[PDB]
């Protein structure tokens, strides 16, 4: 699986974890050089596992849906906790033999957020903060869980979607930070960005609809071409065509 052990980790081993994780994902072909992810995949290949150990050697294994980089479930020791409203497949092929519990919330930011009474703009990301969520996830408790899960997906799934986010957490290695407004907006927008870069093949570069983002400082701008600085060296994983278009952005 894609390994990352916090007990040996530096800004270097963290980018390599992300770099490796970006490259066990199957994609069908690079759209504007951003790998585009399969809408449909033989369930044998559906899920990839990330192998996360903390400073103090708590190993949890978390499952990623390659079809959309979502985290679907996670195993601690030999209990295995699934999001409410997972893939059915996930339940069959994954963590066989473990008592399998279904967390009371779906895995999406606005649920997670509720269960946590705490929007992620108030939750310290960072490499120390990762290695803590792993401790509060290993030793599961329904109070602790949901905010620990907020930390886990942003420092891994969104890091692999957006190099802006990968870079930020590579910066904070012996300290934590907070989502700046730009990291949030990339987060809330990977999908509309995927839908429009997909469309923007047909009209030779330009978006069909514009995508609205916010600078760290609070300045609302918009990107509207695959030329723009966000598309151009930032985005690294494209949302599967079916998922990205069903929703109007
Ligand atoms: C999921 O991720 C886990 C975390 O990395 C993997 O488990 C760990 O695997 C590593 C290496 O792959 C392994 O590390 C060794 O730890 C030992 C240190 O402890 C001993 O120290 C002295 C030595 O004489 C003894 O006197 C003490 O009493 C301790 O017992 C030692 O064998 C090695 O030196 C390794 O550590 C070094 O660390 C610094 C690096 O620079 C070096 O490259 C490296 O050699 C641990 O067993 C384990 N760690 C923890 C905290 O859990 C896991 O894969 C493993 O699974 C086990 C079954 C297998 O035997 C291997 O260890 C490895 O495959 C990984 N994969 C999966 C599928 O979950």
**From the alpha-carbon coordinates, what is the Rg to the nearest angstrom?**
17 Å
Q: How far apart are the first and last residues' alpha carbons, in Å?
A: 32 Å
Kindly give the count of domains: 2
Largest sheet entry? 6 strands, mixed
CATH class of the largest domain: Alpha Beta
Structural class: alpha+beta
Characterize the overall form.
globular
Order of secondary-structure elements: EHEEEEEEHEHEHHHEHHEEHH
How many DSSP-defined strands?
A: 12
CATH topology (fold) name of the largest domain: Ricin (A subunit), domain 1
Tell me the helix content. 25-40%
* CATH level-four homologous superfamily name of the largest domain: Ricin (A subunit), domain 1
Strand content: 15-25%
InterPro entries: Ribosome-inact_prot_sf, Ribosome_inactivat_1/2, Ribosome_inactivat_prot, Ribosome_inactivat_prot_CS, Ribosome_inactivat_prot_sub1, Ribosome_inactivat_prot_sub2
EC number: 3.2.2.22
Catalytic activity: Endohydrolysis of the N-glycosidic bond at one specific adenosine on the 28S rRNA
GO molecular function, one term: rRNA N-glycosylase activity
